[PDB]
Design a protein around this ligand. Structure first.
Ligand SMILES: [Co+2]
Length: 564
């Protein structure tokens, strides 16, 4: 073996291989039962690399450990070898977290990477599978490249593969493959899954201070729940082995091919195990990650919930607790439009630009590539920095520990102080899942028409205590300052004069069933308001949102499916 033949396989294209912004996800059975589905797509990706540049190109390959990953990596290798790709760098056992791929691409100046993950979607023999393509800055492929891959996938007529090539994913080092009658070899470098990423965090944070925090007398007690996904080994090797947290800090930190039969999705119910652990009051800090590691939930003592919109605000407000930002400075803050305005209060107090983007990474990456963005957040458990071009779940955790280490206060006390300083943006997201598509569209269209009337600005809404006055109402548009793209229809906003907002979106992917996402952001500054139950303080704006949108009338829903 190890000298292998190159073969050409005649194939028949499928028409549904759209790469999207977060990858091609299909049921695993689809990859398995649809002949050459994966081979075709892997070939389409490689055809976007100019033939003349392939020998000097490196692709980074790894994934989140879910069922079918290793088979796909073998398939990526067999096809990369046959197409003349010079080198793959593959994490051991195929394991690379998504922030780790971003780290490695940028570090070694790779042309890009292929990440085998479906993020928070279930995995296993009956679960989902995903294939994600990243380009040379370590981030998601932009629309121009994903368009080309899609166009190729629909009309591909043959692909190249080395059918007898097999990579040993389990042993570190360089494996070389000689291709029959090809002059130059194919090289695979298997790297430790954690090292390059850990070395990055070691530069970014003060691991000494963290070691003192987590070790010893009066240590901060933490529980870090990787939800049986990719971040497990990162937790064990970084938080436990290097930084000295007791071994019990690492919860569900063995990657499982089915994520233990659960959704590796961090929130209070999918991560019920972590929350209940935290409820005992014995530990100071808890966190959960998603399957591929770019999302994070932060919990405090007794299970105190730091909502993601508040989290980026606390980091922003204490950002120089982190050595990285001490060196680079803070170039800007950003959030997606539906994320709460907690970050804005800080960006205004610290006089830093606040960028409000449509949902989606591309907008942050552009701003980061322009050196105009240091810290970004999304209401969906996302926090990141410009250290890479993906969001970074464990990075956010190590950021919190830096602030806890510097502040020497509890998580809950830090949040109360923040609310005392900046006011609190009470925030919740209502999901209405699988609603009939026709009604939702009429709901959005009618609401947009209502808001578009000249008299709507200035309309007053009574609450049962306060009056909310409409300051601005539109359908969100964004002119991207880097690539010049204009993103239109990004969400109906009801902006009130007191700093509160209601935002409606109808969810994109509404093909299995539409989703209405209603976000409520109620700002309060008075001390007699800042420590009450959020769902109580949010009730008036919820009432106003449902009345003005007539959500119940258009859909028959008396309640959202999920509340976060
Ligand atoms: Co993810």
């Amino acid at each position: 073996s190890n000298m292998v033949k190159i073969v050409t396989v005649k194939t028949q294209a499928y028409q549904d291989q759209k790469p999207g912004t977060s990858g091609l996800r299909k049921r695993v059975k689809v990859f398995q039962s649809s002949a050459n589905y994966a081979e075709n797509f892997i070939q389409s990706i490689i055809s976007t690399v100019e033939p003349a540049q392939r020998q000097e190109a490196t692709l980074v390959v790894g994934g989140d450990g879910r069922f079918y990953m290793k088979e796909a990596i073998q398939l990526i290798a067999r096809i990369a070898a046959a197409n003349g790709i010079g080198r793959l760098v593959i994490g051991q056992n195929g394991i690379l977290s998504t922030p780790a791929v971003s780290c490695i691409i940028r570090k070694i100046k790779a042309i890009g990477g292929i990440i085998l993950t479906a993020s928070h979607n279930p995995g296993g023999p009956n679960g989902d599978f995903g294939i994600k393509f990243n380009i040379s800055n370590g981030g998601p492929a932009p629309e121009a490249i994903t368009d080309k891959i899609f166009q190729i996938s629909k009309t591909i007529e043959e692909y190249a593969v080395c059918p007898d090539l097999k990579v040993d994913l389990g042993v570190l080092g360089k494996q070389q493959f000689d291709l029959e009658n090809k002059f130059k070899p194919f090289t695979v470098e298997i790297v430790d899954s954690v090292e390059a990423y850990a070395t990055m965090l070691r530069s970014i944070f003060d691991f000494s201070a963290l070691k003192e925090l987590l070790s010893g007398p009066n240590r901060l007690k933490i529980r870090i729940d990787a939800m049986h996904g990719v971040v497990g080994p990162y937790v064990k090797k970084i938080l436990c082995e290097e930084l000295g947290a007791p071994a019990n800090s690492a919860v569900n930190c063995v990657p499982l091919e089915d994520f233990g039969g659960h959704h590796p999705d961090p929130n209070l119910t999918y991560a019920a195990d972590l929350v209940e652990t935290m409820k005992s009051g014995e530990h100071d800090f808890g966190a959960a990650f998603d399957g591929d590691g770019d999302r994070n939930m932060i919990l405090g003592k007794h299970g105190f919930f730091v909502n993601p919109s508040d989290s980026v605000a606390v980091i922003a407000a204490n950002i120089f607790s982190i050595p990285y930002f001490q060196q680079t400075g803070v170039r800007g803050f950003a959030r997606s439009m539906p994320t709460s305005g907690a970050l804005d209060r800080v960006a205004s107090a610290t006089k830093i630009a606040l960028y409000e983007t449509p949902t989606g990474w591309k907008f942050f990456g552009n701003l980061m590539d322009a050196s105009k963005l240091s810290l970004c957040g999304e209401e969906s458990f996302g926090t990141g920095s410009d250290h890479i071009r993906e969001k970074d779940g464990l990075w956010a955790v190590l950021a919190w520990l830096s602030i806890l280490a510097t502040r020497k206060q509890s998580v809950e006390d830090i949040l109360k102080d923040h609310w005392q300083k900046y006011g609190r943006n009470f925030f919740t997201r209502y999901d209405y899942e699988e609603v009939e598509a026709e009604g939702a569209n009429k709901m959005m269209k009618d609401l947009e028409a209502l808001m578009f009337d000249r008299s709507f600005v200035g309309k007053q809404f009574s609450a049962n205590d306060k009056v909310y006055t409409v300051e601005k109402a539109d359908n969100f548009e964004y002119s991207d300052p880097v690539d010049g793209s204009i993103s239109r229809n990004q969400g109906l906003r009801l902006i009130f004069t007191d700093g509160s907002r209601i935002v409606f979106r109808l969810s994109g992917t509404g093909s299995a069933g539409a989703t209405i996402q209603l976000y409520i952001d109620s700002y309060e500054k008075d001390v007699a308001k800042i420590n009450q139950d959020p769902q109580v303080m949010l009730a008036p704006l919820i009432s106003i949102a449902l009345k003005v949108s007539q959500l119940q009338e258009r859909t028959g829903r008396t309640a959202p499916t999920v509340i976060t």
